[PDB]
Amino acid sequence: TIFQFPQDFMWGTATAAYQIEGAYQEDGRGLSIWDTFAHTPGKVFNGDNGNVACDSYHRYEEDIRLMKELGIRTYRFSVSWPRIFPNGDGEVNQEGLDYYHRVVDLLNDNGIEPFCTLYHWDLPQALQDAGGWGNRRTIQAFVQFAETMFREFHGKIQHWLTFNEPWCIAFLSNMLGVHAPGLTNLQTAIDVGHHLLVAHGLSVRRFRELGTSGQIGIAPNVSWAVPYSTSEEDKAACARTISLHSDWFLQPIYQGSYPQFLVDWFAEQGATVPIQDGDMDIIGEPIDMIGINYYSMSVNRFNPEAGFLQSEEINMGLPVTDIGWPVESRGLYEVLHYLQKYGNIDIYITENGACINDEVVNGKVQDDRRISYMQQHLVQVHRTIHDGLHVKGYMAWSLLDNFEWAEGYNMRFGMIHVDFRTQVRTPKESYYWYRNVVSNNWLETRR
Amino acid sequence: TIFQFPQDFMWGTATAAYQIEGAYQEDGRGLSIWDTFAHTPGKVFNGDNGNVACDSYHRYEEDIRLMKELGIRTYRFSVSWPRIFPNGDGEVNQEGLDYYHRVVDLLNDNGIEPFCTLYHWDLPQALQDAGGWGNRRTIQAFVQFAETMFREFHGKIQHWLTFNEPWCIAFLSNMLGVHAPGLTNLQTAIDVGHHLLVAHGLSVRRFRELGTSGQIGIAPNVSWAVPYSTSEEDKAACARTISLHSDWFLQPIYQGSYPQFLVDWFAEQGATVPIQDGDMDIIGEPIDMIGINYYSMSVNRFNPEAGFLQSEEINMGLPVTDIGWPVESRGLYEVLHYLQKYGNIDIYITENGACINDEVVNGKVQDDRRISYMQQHLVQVHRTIHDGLHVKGYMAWSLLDNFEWAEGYNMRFGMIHVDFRTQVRTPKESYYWYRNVVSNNWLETRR
Amino acid sequence: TIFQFPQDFMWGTATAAYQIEGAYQEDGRGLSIWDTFAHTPGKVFNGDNGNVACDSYHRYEEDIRLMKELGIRTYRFSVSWPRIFPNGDGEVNQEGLDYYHRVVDLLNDNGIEPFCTLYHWDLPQALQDAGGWGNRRTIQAFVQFAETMFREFHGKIQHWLTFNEPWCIAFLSNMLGVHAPGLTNLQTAIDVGHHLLVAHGLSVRRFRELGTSGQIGIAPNVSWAVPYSTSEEDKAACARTISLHSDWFLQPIYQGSYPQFLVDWFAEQGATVPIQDGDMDIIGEPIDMIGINYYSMSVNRFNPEAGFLQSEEINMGLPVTDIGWPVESRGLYEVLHYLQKYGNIDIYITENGACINDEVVNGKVQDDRRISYMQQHLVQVHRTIHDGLHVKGYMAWSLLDNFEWAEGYNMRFGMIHVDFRTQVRTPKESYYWYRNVVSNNWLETRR
Amino acid sequence: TIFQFPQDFMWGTATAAYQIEGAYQEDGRGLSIWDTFAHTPGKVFNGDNGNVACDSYHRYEEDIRLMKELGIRTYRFSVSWPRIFPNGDGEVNQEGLDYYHRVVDLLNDNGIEPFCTLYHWDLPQALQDAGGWGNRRTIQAFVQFAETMFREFHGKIQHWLTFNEPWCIAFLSNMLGVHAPGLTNLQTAIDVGHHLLVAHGLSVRRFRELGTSGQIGIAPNVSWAVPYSTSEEDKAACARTISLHSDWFLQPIYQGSYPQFLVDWFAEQGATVPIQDGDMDIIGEPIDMIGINYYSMSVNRFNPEAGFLQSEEINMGLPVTDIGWPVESRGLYEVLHYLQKYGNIDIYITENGACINDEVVNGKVQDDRRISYMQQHLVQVHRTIHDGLHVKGYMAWSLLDNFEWAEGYNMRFGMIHVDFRTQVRTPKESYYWYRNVVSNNWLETRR
């Protein structure tokens, strides 16, 4: 089978600042909650951290040359807040802005459209000291950050995202404690979720008022769960699992309210959303599109002992990636159709990839399993496009192997291999395969 | 995850006579349409045939010892018609009956319940000469065959199946010409399908009248297709693909009629079912259970050029077995629920397996992919049982590697490896894994 | 055995523009029917194309250095028409001419004689839009192209070829649809064949009138078939196979007429050659020599179902190259003697090579099978020379691995390996072997 | 391509007594010229000999079981003269006859038709002492031998051959000195050749007079040479090469005379055929068929220094077997057509095989090159059959690896590997391939 993509389909790759930039104390960068987290024994595997990472702070030119050869149309990257406002609230660090000007200008010079992600988890530690996202003052700190970028990069960037993966930022980080700041409190997770939504709404307003160029949206990480049994309880369990990732952030944005069943669920656990008058109206600020991050899908059943959502994931025996996630691409098809509940909105798959740990052997990285994973998912993308959904682009998760948050450097997601000992980049076999797909603008599955 | 199975769940393996018995001219066996087919240049890969196969005609004792060590409860095998009635119509060949008495007695001696499949494609050539299943005289020849077996093996066998895979017998064999007799005529395929249904109905009547011991049913091979797009045409294409395999044979049996949409579909192609008065009533003879043969699932779309059903199968990029079939177990779950349209009938998974060609290396066959395939499917079986469906047992397709019909010996489906050069049996790693599941009566998926 | 070659024997290698130059949109190059063809899903394997190829547009200096070390005397290359006349008819693109001046001057500086092939399949798309070779206007467009080159490179090139492989240009491309433009119409194939012959004749006239330096000819790809049985029908089948490749283009050129039996053959299929008064006289323009491209030989039999020539090729069990062609060098000896029907004309083996896919292992490409293939064929060349035939030179097909038309980059024919990921050149073992043969001017077969 | 063979086509394998029987002093066997030759330092590679060989004298039952599994129809073997008449002239050794009765009876019991070769080079030393084949008394000794066998095995054998490879017996052995008795004298070679022809004629007479069962013929080894150049001298050189192997023995047999050009050739070298009155008439005794032994083909040129035939063989660069012979099957097709000069006589390919030295690795002998060689030659056999020639059967040269005359055990020609250290037989991959061809009675060449 041959899968022809739309003429204007946007092909790209993506990265996040703390995962690739390696100059954590350079040019006046202040510490983020992630520097703090990684610097804490027991938080990240093997004590790895992003002090050096891929040193993309210094090696951006080579990376951009590589992605220019890839024949890619856009590059999604995140901005390091503590590089712009080291304190989070103080004065602007012109050195920080300069770095991103060097990067963006280079991208533009190379005909690659920057796709800017304002927040990708690196909250300045100073603000966390004052309570972080649990404190509404952070909402103002963020809007200042957003404005600075909107004004500084006006006609240079045409695609913007406020937050990347609100579910991870709020629940994984503050309820499960797996990601910075590493807290484990339901109410705290809810406060964070609510405040980032307000911050998001306000930033879009500013985007509009300043008349900044381009389109702006948010990129939630999406979950998809299917019930093990036909029981209403298993069905409910999957509804909770699915809704907390997307609906909890998208319903307020699109329909002016939080998913009531989840509101009632958390109420039973003693937590309530800190909604002030005017908040929901602010959150409902019209957005141009959303980014969708998809990796896996699960088969769940109701289990009272299965965490705060009482939704147990069944190990169905399916083959998994090197990080342990089963690959089942139908989930992408399913979730994109599910999201039509908000209308046939513009959607960009901002992240899709797999952890395949192959290394350089005889001068190449034979990551056949990454090519396989990607092929299956791109088929689902073509499928939705042909069902009439407005899926506008696809960004391969990870141009480069990087600091995988709590996994450290132990889990590789990149299309370009990075030997952290030498900083040497070696485009994997998936890279050359992808260069073909994006350049031909059509995909082919063969036996 | 741990998956506990029901106390009385029936675990087994299966084979077919022409695929394993290797004494095609021995003890007065007459030729079958398959001997003829395989003996024709270009019909079977590499000119392979079942002249010797696994020589199970002589090696049954070793095989039975091996399956006794497997801790299995039943063994599904087929009876070679041309061994019983070399002519198909003439007098009984006592030598043929004796062989099966040796086999059945041995199984019974070993506490393994025989699960007898009367027809597994080996129609005596003589009958094919007179028209085969296209001629109603064959229906009578079959009933004589069935009676002989019912009377001969009365209190020795408690589970019987009339036909195995009516779809392959009728359409693959007579419309697509891939299997014996290798014809390519729609009307002929429909005649065969209709006459085997009448033969089936009559044989059940005889089973009932003779008061033969046990239960009796039929074992259709099941297909499952999911639409690529949400279009009604793609949906219709899948309905045709699904219904021809099961509904076309099960609706007459359970609801007294053929699927009208398929009746209309074939009518458009100039073919009509040769229904005589009384036929549908005969076909509707109450059966005790059905056997279900499942291997794969597909994503289809409507395509006017895609064969007589105009249903094109999309290559979704999924990993495939060594014969090229993608593995997606959900299909088993889906089809079992779909079949509930005939009521919560007793169902036995009479066949489920995969072509994994691993050979003996360092004394063992490391068929990890077969273990993987099986695990995923057994999970679906437990799932349906827990949804309340009456799935009564599971038979691993192929105790032994064998003559894979048109594929020859080139495609291995067994849990026990057979070196066709030496006839040496080497139980694969999947065998020992299965021995554990069937003996423990519970399965566990682990990372 | 030692095979001493003539003192003035011309040793070389060959390439084609679209196969190696990799700057399809650079310096005003217009699209060719091959850019179009390769850019169409399903036309070329894996969607490969010549956008980059070997990037010889930029790497010619390295290649020329490498072929200078090879000790070669001439280099056969083709000119990209759409680089000279982007439209095919419009004004000259001086940038295009400049490139070839850089190449030719460098060759000349290195004592390597350029052997210029004006047409190697890259017809400007614009002309194809107007009908391509099916339209006589294209004949004029071509003559303008030829003149431009004759005048531009006057005393720089001494060997010229009008067309390379007329059989592929006409029949493979327009009847079988395997090569650009991918048509499947007999009459169209015949029109193309006839118009390229007229174009050829006219261009030789211009060559003569302009007093351009050197010699000029045409290079048909040669076929050779031997009958399976002694039957007249098998004999006729081979005559058709042989004659369409060579006689169909050479008889008009040398004897003023088309092979009548083939004329009658196509007449039976409803096609007739569009011959205008004066055409045959133009086509009969005296040429200095011909180039012969040979790769394989076959054993054929008459078969009414075997394509438009009803000549079936028998798989004799002979070993084949990696692209599936059996190697049997006698065919070269046979065809060269056969061609004596046109007189003892000057013949240059413009192409001879094999697809051997060996890659770089431990720093080298151990292409022993290419050395083997070449040795066998060079023996046949010496043989004909000693039978008194005027075989003047031998050009190894493919200096570099390249874009193999419909095969993509999947089939390697070069003596110098190219890693398309890095553009790195690695001379194969056949290169060093050839360097010895061409430098010593004698070959030795040893046990 | 599929090559269907005739219903009654005779498939077999072949061996020679001294090459496989390993009991040189057992049961009163007298020494042969080959025992003597091999026991001489410098005559056979590594001083190997046939003292033990494959020990088929004791292991015949296993071999026969193996060839019964091969599905073969006939078995060609030779009789050890010094086992029957240890002296060559004295009284019969009943022990010797008994051995062959054990062998023949077993073959017959297994439905394998014995194809008896009376003389396969093992002349009793005693006779060689008296001059061997150079002495006409040997002619009488041979006829006694023949009669003994004809009478002893009357209704047990239906196919007989007098001599196997007269060219090797006469010229290779007496002119070139490569085979026993190792002489190097033209006249001696001619005497041997003439006396074996007289011996042959007389033995056929006895066959006829005794009314022995079956058919009888002779099996010359065939050569085929093609001229390098079109020169009459090269053409003559090939005529000499071809004619000495076949015509020199077949023209006397079929046309009552020796090839005059060869007679004149040897006359120039001072040798003349010792023809007595009545000799040619005796030699012309009508025979039922001939056996043809073919292995290779060559391209020759006239060279005054190239041996007694002044025919030099050119190394064309073609791939060779492990013994150094190039494989080119067309030669079989060519020679069979050439032999039609004697009429469309019945011909059996009594020997065809290749030296491929693969050993047992992981329990098997992966002799793909033997399968390849055989496939190419069987195609030529089908081809001639379809050209209407009476090629009646094919015998694979060497059922077992054996004592390869002057090569010792260093060159393997068998389909069944023999470890001379253990005498263990391991059927090679070619064996299983052949089992399929002979059992299906059709061959298929595939890519």
UniProtKB/Swiss-Prot annotation, chains A, B, C, D:
Instruction: List the Gene Ontology MF annotations in alphabetical order.
Output: beta-glucosidase activity
Alphabetically sorted, this entry's keywords are: Carbohydrate metabolism, Cellulose degradation, Glycosidase, Hydrolase, Polysaccharide degradation
* Listed GO CC annotations: cytosol
Q: Which Gene3D superfamilies match?
A: Glycosidases
Query: Domain of life here?
Result: Bacteria
Per the record, what are the reactions this protein catalyses? Answer: Hydrolysis of terminal, non-reducing beta-D-glucosyl residues with release of beta-D-glucose
Q: Which residues carry out catalysis?
A: 165, 351
The record's PROSITE patterns line, in alphabetical order, gives: GLYCOSYL_HYDROL_F1_1, GLYCOSYL_HYDROL_F1_2
Q: Biological process (GO) annotations?
A: cellulose catabolic process
User: EC?
Assistant: 3.2.1.21
> Whom does it interact with, and what assembly results?
Homooctamer.
Function summary: BglA is intracellular and cleaves cellobiose probably through inorganic phosphate mediated hydrolysis.
Record-stated family: Belongs to the glycosyl hydrolase 1 family.
Its name, as the record gives it, is Beta-glucosidase A
